[PDB]
Each structure stands twice: as C-alpha cells, then as structure tokens.
C-alpha cells in the first residue's frame, strides 16, 4: 500500500498538468515511466508495474 | 584395508562434499541469472529485502520475479502456447524455466 | 516425550532445515557477486577457470578477487584506516567484506 | 619447591589479570574517543547528561552514539552490505565496532 | 573417545616440547647425552629429558640464579615448574647468546 | 531381476578394467605375464590381475614413489585401495612418459 500510495501521489501530480494542458491546448500527455532504458520506450509493454 | 580403508571412506565423504559443492554452484548460476534479470528489468518494490520483510520464502521470491519477467517480456500468445494457459500463477517449475529462457531470448533480441 | 515435546522438536528441525536452505541460497548469491565483479572489473587472467587450473581453492579465488577489487577501487588511506594496515594479504573475513562493500559502492559512485 | 612453583603460577595468573586491567583501561580510552566523536559529529540532544537523565545505561549511550554515527557518515549502501541488513538496531558488537571504524574513515576522507 | 583425543593432544604437546629440547641440546651440550646412548646406559625417557634439562640449566643459567631463584645450588633435586622456570631462563640466555 | 542387472553392470565394469589393464601390460611389461601362460602356471584371474597391477607399479612408479604411497617398499602385501592408488600412479607415469 505504501508504494501504491506514492504512485498515486505522482499520478495526481501528473494529472493536474494533464488536465491543464487538456484545457489550454486540447490534448494532454502523461508518460508512464517503467524500469526501462531511454531507447526501450519505443518497444511496446505487455504487463509491467510502473515506476 | 583397515586404516587406509577408513581414510578412503573419508575420501568418499570428500566426494560427497564435492558433489554438494557442485550442486551449490548450480544453484548459484540459476538463482543468480534470475536475480540479475530481476534487478535489471523489474521494479525496486520487488527487491528481496522488501519481499522478505513482507515475509515470503526466497523460492517464492524467485518464482514471483520469474513470473513478472515472463509477463513483462514474453508475449501472452507465447505464454498461452508454451504454458498452455494464460495464467502463470500455477506454472512454477520446468515450464517456468522454459518461459524465463524465452524471456532471456526476448530481452537479448530487444537489446 | 510428550506431544508438546514432539511438536517443538519437529518445529526446530524444520526451522533448522529452512535456515540451511537460506544459507545455501546466500552462498549462491555470493558466488554470483564474485563472478560478476571478476568479469566486469578485473582482468581475464583472474578468471576462475585459469585460477583453478593453477590449483587454487574456490574460497581462495573469491578472496583473491575481493582483494584485487579492493586495491583497484578502495583508496590506500581507506584501506589503512578500515583494516588498520596497508597490506590486505591477511585481512580476509568480515573486514574483507567491509573493503569489498566499500569497493562495491566506489564503483557505483564512479559510474 | 612445588609450593614455590605453584605460587609462581598463581602470581602469573595475577599478572594476566593485571593485563586484563590494562585492556579495561584501553577500552575506557576507546569509550572517551567515541564520546569525542559523538560531541564532534552529533547533536546536543544525544549528550550523555540528557541520555542519563532519560535513564539509559552507559553502554546503551555508547551504542546509540555509534549507531547514529554509522548512519550519519557510513552511507546506507555500505551499512546494508556490512550488517547484511539495513537496520542497525540489533547489530551492536564487533560488527558495530567495524562500522564505527568505517565511520571514522568516512569523516577522515570527508575532511 | 574425545577424552582419548585430548590425551593424544597432550601427547603431541609433550612430544613437541621434547623435540625442541632435543634439537637444541644436541647442538649445544654434547653427543654423549644422546637419546640412544642414554637409553643404552639404561635411563627412562622422562629421566633422560629431565637430565638434559638440568644440563641445559647448568650450561646457560648461572649458578647465582640457581641458588637464588631455585634456592639450591644443586639442580639434582629441584625438579618441577621450578625446573620449568630454569629452562625458560636458559632459553632466554641462549636467545641472547 | 534389476539386482542381477546391476550385478551384470558391475561385471562389465570390472571386465573392461581387466581388458584395459591387460592391453597396456602386454605392450608395456612383457609377454611372460600373459593371461594364458599365467593361467597355465596356475594363478586365478584376480591373482593374475593383481600381480599385473603390482608389476605395472614396479615398472612405471619408481621404487621411491612406491614406498611413498604404499608406505612399504614391498608391493607384495599392500593390496587394496593403496594398490589402486599405485596403479593409477602407474597410469599417470605412462601418460607423462
């Protein structure tokens, strides 16, 4: 529950700016960061627990 | 015979101890490739320290890491083909070893 | 011998076997750490194969790799103040574990 | 005679006890050195006076100061690797002496 | 059987002490006090060892220390850990010699 | 019947060992110690094998190593695990030869 609560805090922080960008521009993007390298972002994800 | 016989029986004991040592080295190789995969590819929340604090046997830790790695790398179709079922919650064993070998191949080709 | 004595003896035996199993797993992970450190930070001449060909025990190989890693990473002042002496040739043990931990974190901060 | 030589052994044992008194004095010197470390590197709230007022034994004060110094100077990565556990709450002893040696080394290199 | 094991340990210890005594005595005193010739003359092993120790004291440890620490000029009857003290003093004397 | 199967396995193992020993001994020691002539002289198969083994030791293993591992200069009565050690030593000596 502690790790999930920290994840929830970061999710809220991301969602605030996501909604702000949705209202100002028309679209908002939130990246779900996992335990991967910068080049691995291109590859798809099957099942993972986000960082 | 006699004195030398008992010393050669102690030598047989040495053979047994060497067999145990080789078995430990095999454990080293297996469990260690597993731990390298776990650290390199899985979250910090699945660390052995926190899992042991939550109270899981180390074999449970290794099988959980293996299952997470298989779900992360091996596709669901490959799981449903090799393991014959989608759920991996009851597939620990030799089939799990095959699945983690496939996951190692997957990460090697991914790099 | 009553029922309570039977239960406590059984539980003690089970816990002892579990602790032995955990010790075997710990030795496995230690063999991993020695192998990976030797492959990554030390020369090919210090490989387990060539050392065994020269005829050294596995524990001797582990401590030699550890000492070489400590000399490579941990500075001489740090060695002289941890182990209280400059020479590491007779510091195998818990203090050797300290020096190798210092080297393990030295390489982390170097990266 | 036999009485003379047995009394010689008696007073030789008394001599060994004298050496024990000397090593007690050396331990007291180590105690005052740890006190100096505590004053130099730790808060005023961990002073021997206030700890004794709160009602802690002198050995408890020394081990608490040592644990705080290890956490302050020795980074948690070394702490975990040395104690084989992250928590220091049950690592008082020779391992704690090794840890406070590592803390002394850390402050020496920091200066 | 560990009682017999410890008995064998004590046997090893006294054998090592005899070894040290012999390796120094043969090179220090004479060949006349060799173990073989003493056994031929008819002395038990303990008698041989104590006689060699007394000769070692008479060679290294000075007579004043003999008559003061051991209280008697004659080492003929002083045997015991007083003889141990005397042979230790002889070891110190040969070390400084 | 698997007990007899394992007995036959051990029979094959010792037969292969005997065949290897005989093949190397014929080319190394002499033809006077051939199985046929020894049987004619009246020695059992195990006696022939142990005699050939002892001759192999006396040939490849020099007498110093012989008395070193056998602990006795004469290989006439050392048979057993020590004899197996000595014949493996003979194999080593012919390998390095």
From TrEMBL, chain A:
By what name is this protein known?
Answer: Phage portal protein
From TrEMBL, chains E, F:
Q: Which UniProt keywords apply?
A: Plasmid
The protein here is known as Uncharacterized protein
């Amino acid at each position: 529950e502690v790790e999930l609560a920290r994840l929830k805090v970061q999710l809220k922080n991301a969602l605030l700016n996501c909604i702000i960008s949705y209202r100002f521009h028309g679209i908002g993007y939130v990246l779900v960061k996992t335990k991967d390298t910068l080049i691995d972002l291109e590859q798809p994800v099957n099942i993972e627990l986000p960082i | 015979l006699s004195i030398n016989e008992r010393i050669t029986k102690e030598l047989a004991e040495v053979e047994e101890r060497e067999r145990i040592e080789k078995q430990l080295l095999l454990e080293a190789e297996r469990i260690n490739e597993i731990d390298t995969l776990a650290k390199a590819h899985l979250s910090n929340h699945f660390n052995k320290e926190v899992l042991l604090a939550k109270g899981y046997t180390l074999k449970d830790i290794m099988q959980a890491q293996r299952r997470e790695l298989v779900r992360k790398f091996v596709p669901i179709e490959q799981i449903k083909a090799i393991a014959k079922v989608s759920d991996i919650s009851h597939i620990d064993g030799e089939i799990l070893e095959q699945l983690v070998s496939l996951a190692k191949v997957n990460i090697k080709l991914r790099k």
